[PDB]
Design a protein around this ligand. Structure first.
Ligand code: HAS
Ligand code: HEM
Ligand SMILES: CCCCCCCC/C=C\CCCCCCCC(=O)OC[C@H](O)CO
Ligand SMILES: CCCCCCCC/C=C\CCCCCCCC(=O)OC[C@H](O)CO
Ligand SMILES: CCCCCCCC/C=C\CCCCCCCC(=O)OC[C@H](O)CO
Ligand SMILES: CCCCCCCC/C=C\CCCCCCCC(=O)OC[C@H](O)CO
Ligand SMILES: CCCCCCCC/C=C\CCCCCCCC(=O)OC[C@H](O)CO
Ligand SMILES: CCCCCCCC/C=C\CCCCCCCC(=O)OC[C@H](O)CO
Ligand SMILES: CCCCCCCC/C=C\CCCCCCCC(=O)OC[C@H](O)CO
Ligand SMILES: CCCCCCCC/C=C\CCCCCCCC(=O)OC[C@H](O)CO
Ligand SMILES: CCCCCCCC/C=C\CCCCCCCC(=O)OC[C@H](O)CO
Ligand SMILES: CCCCCCCC/C=C\CCCCCCCC(=O)OC[C@H](O)CO
Ligand SMILES: CCCCCCCC/C=C\CCCCCCCC(=O)OC[C@H](O)CO
Ligand SMILES: CCCCCCCC/C=C\CCCCCCCC(=O)OC[C@H](O)CO
Ligand SMILES: CCCCCCCC/C=C\CCCCCCCC(=O)OC[C@H](O)CO
Ligand code: CUA
Ligand SMILES: [O-][O-]
Ligand SMILES: [Cu+2]
Lengths: 166, 554, 31
């Protein structure tokens, strides 16, 4: 009886555990797939790229927001974005649809998020570090940037804009 | 009391529990206001009239996170995972150390509480540099957490004493849980201890000019993942070893319970890059490795789901239930000590499902830093862990105090746990759904009422949740105080055995139990895993540090 | 057989799968 129930419980549990293992492995394989596709461009470059937050608004590629979008390939643009308390520059960021965009984002103050609504771009922005992510916008129009990392009392109203031109 | 003279460990257990439940009460006061906020309703004017020291949404959210997720959970873990192994062994914890751990927790709490309450550390419970809190917040918090190093020593002492009396016996179950749990915690804790000692403390004292935010986050999340398993495991020890008795059955496998705990000791710590999928300067291959090991740490709860479900089914069958659902209705739905963890386990189904999504690397970009995250973790800690601790009021309290629970108090406990549960379920729906709509977490969104028009529908669930949980919390406060301040005392209640389950009869795999009992070994494995998972990344970060100045933006 | 424990793990599996595959669809839609 208790002997019986015990044997049956462990038998089926071994089955569930194999099944649950299988399912986790399928997820692993489905994740590896994403990593091989263009959708993995939003994963940050793993690369340490150190900058100085106290001079980033005075010298170097973030110091002139109207020149922040730079053609770096025949179908590629690099955008130097500053996330700061409490906004983004340039504003708007203007890019052509269907080009590959390399965003290089940093902060002069505290950590901010950089979440482009409607896309998988969703990256933390650390002072002293450059976050590099890539994305190709397929649809023209206006996309909102939301700050999703608490950065102080201006956080809830910290937004920016990307304009993707036809 | 002659009971406290023989079992002084009941009194120190009581002090941990009561302090913990007081923190839960105070931190939870902000919860309804935050839920209304996520429902686009701004009730902060009211909150500030009532509590005039609250200067902002964010100061209330710092208090809520620290008090509920850090202070309450730790105090409960120190109560349960010292007292239960001591009762199973029938041995006295070193009482000098027990008391010292309490006073450290109490003192650390009081010291951190001062800048928190004075608006001098509105940096949230993650305190990410360069946001720069008052030195007393970091010092109070450091001393609060180091309290647990004393607990670890307490339980390893219990275990060693017992093993010396009983060479060649395997570790008793509850003790084996608590030993692997506290050793896991020791390894886990070193991330934050390092972040504190090497960076946060000297910085907030003015000794260094900045802190590298990436190294501080990396060391934070070394600890911040396993801290969640540190919250969870004391509820699991009850669910495995006490709940089956309360349900009217037996634990169906002692070896499966040990195996889950052993997987937590090996897998709880080397996984924290799953909090850093959106972080720069960590290599993607390392993110993928932590993602894979995160999916593995899911295995012990997947195993727990079956061991525990089968135990509950067993109890329901003992009690006359038949069919495929009759076992559910036969369970003791009139007992709050039974009902609270069971409801928390039901919410843990969608809770764990969200966690497996979050763990999935690229999938994390859909939900990271959005309302989904709080949606997931309120199912896990604010529902499962918290409800399991609330249900403990109904067997643990009487056991510690001799205070009886009346019929009326039992019924009010049922109402509290039901409303708390349903409130968490309703709010989980509104936050998961708002997060899928890109609503950010940690945001006073009611102050930008036109920013989130698409979220109008989940917002109504958040408002409803906020009201349901306000009512649950108020009933909880009333209830906790009624049993606490209650007139009668029956010392026989303080002297009755804890309601530990029996384990079902059948063998039981001794080869496996003996292998699992090689605790020195498994501990070295867990440690090597952490060196392998974190070493290479941390050697690169520490050799390229870039400290940056601190900011106060509140 | 532990039919009730199997029902529970069934509900759990379906929930994991709806969550995971749902978010996986969202991910590609925003890709
Ligand atoms: C106690 C609290 C916690 C639990 C437990 C927990 C579990 C997991 N989480 Fe998590 N979590 C993450 C992944 C997971 C995974 C893989 C799991 C797993 O361990 C889950 C495994 C569990 C299951 C597979 C469920 C098993 C089902 C059971 C055991 C119930 C069975 C039912 C029964 C027996 C009842 C039947 C009876 C009847 C009557 C029918 C990730 C990333 O991978 C993030 C970062 C996301 C981001 O972008 O920031 C995250 C964020 C958090 C945060 C936010 C931290 C912050 O402030 O930034 C907290 C507080 C938290 C808490 C908790 N989390 N989580
Ligand atoms: C009356 C019950 C409570 C309700 C209504 C509630 C509501 C809230 C809401 C709506 C949020 C999201 C706020 C934001 O992102 O800006 C939040 C954050 C939080 N909650 Fe709760 N809460 C409750 C109880 C719990 C308890 C019991 C736990 C832990 C045991 C807890 C831990 C947390 C923490 C860890 C956060 C995140 C803090 C941060 O991001 O800095 N909550 N809660
Ligand atoms: C989800 C499926 C998980 C349960 C998988 C059930 C596997 C079948 C099993 O283990 O059955 C052995 C038992 O002895 C039968 O006679
Ligand atoms: C019995 C053993 C058979 C078990 C096989 C498991 C099937 C699961 C996933 C395959 C992954 C498909 C990978 C293709 C992904 C493409 C995609 O999602 O397009 C966007
Ligand atoms: C519990 C119930 C769960 C209910 C879940 C609702 C999930 C909804 C949406 C995710 C879809 C995201 C799709 C991304 C496209 C949005 C878009 O295209 O927007 C901006 C762009 O600027 C245009 O120019
Ligand atoms: C409780 C633990 C509290 C930690 C406080 C002090 C510990 C020792 C700190 C020693 C401080 C050295 C600071 C230093 O060397 O600063 C380097 C300077 O930034 C380069 O020019
Ligand atoms: C032991 C109690 C207090 C340590 C006092 C530490 C005092 C450090 C004060 C420095 C400070 O506040 O610097 C800004
Ligand atoms: C235990 C399991 C340990 C081993 C598990 C598998 C890790 C293997 C390869 C990671 C490859 C990831 C490469 C992703 C780079 C994405 C990219 O190119 O970003 C744009
Ligand atoms: C937005 C979602 C909000 C809704 C949230 C609900 C989610 C599931 C709710 C309750 C589960 C209860 C399942 C089992 C309840 C059993 C009680 C029972 O069977 O009672 C028998 C009778 O009392 C003889 O003892
Ligand atoms: C249409 C849906 C409407 C939205 C829900 C509104 C919220 C709460 C109602 C109150 C629920 C209170 C449930 C108490 C159950 C209880 O106490 O049950 C004891 C029971 O006999 C077994 O444990
Ligand atoms: C679980 C218990 C039931 C929960 C919520 C009721 C459902 C409320 C959904 C009604 C939407 C109300 C709303 O805000 O309307 C949408 C928008 O305004 C259109 O113009
Ligand atoms: C007997 C107790 C059970 C009663 C519980 C009801 C059960 C669920 C339904 C509705 C409650 C909704 C409460 C939400 C309150 C107002 C919603 C709101 O703020 O409306 C915004 C609107 O969508 C744009 O202006
Ligand atoms: C304990 C569980 C408590 C459940 C409480 C349900 C909240 C009331 C809903 C009725 C609708 C009242 C909304 C009327 C005005 C809404 C508005 O104007 O906002
Ligand atoms: C007395 C407790 C403090 C002991 C110091 C380390 C002991 C330990 O690390 O535990 C491994 C286990 O003892 C393997 O025998
Ligand atoms: C208890 C708490 C319960 C929380 C409920 C959240 C439930 C499931 C997540 C499923 C993800 C939903 C995604 C649907 C959107 C979809 O299918 O995506 C294709 C569309 O094109 C996209 O833009
Ligand atoms: Cu910038 Cu929040
Ligand atoms: O934290 O999961
Ligand atoms: Cu984690």
């Amino acid at each position: 009886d208790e002997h019986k129930a015990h044997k049956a419980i462990l038998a089926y549990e071994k089955g569930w555990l194999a099944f649950s293992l299988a399912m986790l492995f399928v997820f692993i394989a489905l994740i590896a797939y994403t990593l091989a596709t263009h959708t993995a461009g939003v994963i940050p470059a793993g690369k340490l790229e150190r900058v100085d937050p106290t001079t980033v608004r005075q010298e170097g590629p973030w110091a002139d927001p109207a020149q922040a979008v730079v053609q770096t390939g025949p179908n590629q643009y690099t955008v130097y974005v500053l996330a700061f308390a409490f906004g983004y520059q340039p504003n708007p960021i203007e890019v052509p649809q269907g080009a590959e965009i390399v965003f290089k984002i940093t902060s002069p103050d505290v950590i901010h998020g950089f979440h482009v609504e409607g896309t998988n771009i969703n990256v933390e922005v650390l002072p002293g570090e450059v976050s590099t992510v890539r994305y190709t916008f397929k649809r023209p129009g206006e996309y909102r940037i939301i700050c999703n990392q608490y950065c102080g009392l201006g956080h809830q109203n910290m937004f920016g804009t990307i304009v993707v031109k036809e | 009391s002659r009971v406290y003279e023989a079992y002084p460990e009941k009194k120190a257990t009581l002090y941990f529990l009561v302090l913990g439940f007081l923190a839960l009460i105070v931190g939870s006061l902000f919860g309804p206001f935050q839920a209304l906020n996520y429902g686009n309703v701004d009730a902060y004017p009211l909150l500030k009239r009532l509590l005039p020291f609250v200067q902002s949404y964010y100061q209330g959210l710092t208090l809520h996170g620290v008090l509920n997720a850090i202070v309450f959970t730790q105090l409960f873990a120190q109560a349960i995972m010292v007292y239960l192994p001591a009762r199973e062994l029938n041995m006295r914890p070193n009482m000098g150390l027990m008391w010292l751990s309490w006073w450290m927790a109490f003192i650390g709490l009081v010291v951190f509480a001062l800048p928190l309450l004075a608006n001098e550390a509105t940096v949230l419970y993650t305190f990410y540099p360069p946001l720069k809190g008052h030195w007393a917040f970091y010092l109070g918090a450091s001393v609060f957490v180091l309290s647990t190093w004393v607990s670890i020593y307490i339980v390893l002492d219990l275990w060693r004493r017992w093993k010396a009396a009983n060479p060649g016996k395997v570790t008793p179950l509850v003790t084996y849980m608590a030993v692997v749990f506290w050793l896991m915690w020791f390894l886990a804790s070193l991330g934050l201890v390092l972040e504190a000692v090497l960076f946060l403390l000297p910085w907030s004292f003015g000794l260094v000019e900045g802190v590298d935010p990436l190294v501080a986050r990396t060391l934070f999340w070394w600890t911040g993942h396993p801290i969640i398993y540190f919250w969870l495991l004391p509820a699991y020890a009850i669910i495995y070893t006490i709940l089956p008795k309360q349900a009217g059955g037996k634990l169906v496998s002692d070896p499966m319970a040990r195996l889950a705990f052993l997987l937590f000791l090996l897998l709880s710590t080397p996984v924290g890059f799953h909090h850093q999928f959106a972080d720069p300067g960590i290599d993607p291959t390392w993110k993928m490795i932590h993602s894979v090991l995160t999916l593995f740490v899911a295995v012990p709860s997947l195993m727990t789901a079956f061991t525990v479900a089968a135990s509950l089914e067993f109890a329901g069958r003992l009690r006359g239930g038949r069919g495929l659902f009759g076992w559910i209705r036969a369970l003791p739905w009139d007992n709050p000590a039974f009902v609270a963890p069971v409801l928390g386990l039901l919410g843990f189904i969608p809770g764990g499902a969200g966690g497996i999504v979050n763990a999935s690397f690229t999938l994390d970009y859909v939900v990271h830093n959005t309302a989904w995250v709080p949606g997931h973790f309120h199912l896990q800690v604010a529902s499962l862990v918290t409800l399991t601790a609330m249900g403990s009021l109904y067997w643990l309290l009487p056991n510690l105090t001799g205070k009886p629970i009346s019929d009326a108090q039992r019924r009010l406990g049922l109402a509290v746990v039901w409303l708390w549960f349903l409130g968490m379920m309703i709010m989980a729906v509104g936050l998961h759904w708002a997060g899928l709509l890109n609503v950010p977490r940690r945001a006073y969104i009611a102050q930008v009422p036109d920013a989130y028009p698409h979220a109008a529908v989940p917002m109504v669930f958040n408002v409803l949740a906020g009201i349901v949980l306000l009512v649950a919390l108020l009933l909880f406060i009333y209830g906790l105080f009624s049993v606490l301040l209650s007139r009668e005392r029956k010392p026989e209640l303080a002297e009755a055995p804890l309601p530990f389950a029996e384990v079902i009869s059948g063998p039981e795999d001794r080869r496996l139990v003996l292998a699992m009992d090689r605790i020195g070994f498994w501990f070295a494995v867990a440690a090597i895993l952490v060196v392998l998972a974190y070493g290479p990344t941390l050697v690169q970060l520490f050799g390229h540090l870039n400290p940056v100045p601190g900011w106060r933006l509140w | 057989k532990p039919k009730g424990a199997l029902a529970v793990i069934l509900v759990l599996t379906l929930t994991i799968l709806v969550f995971w595959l749902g978010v996986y669809a969202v991910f590609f839609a925003r890709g």
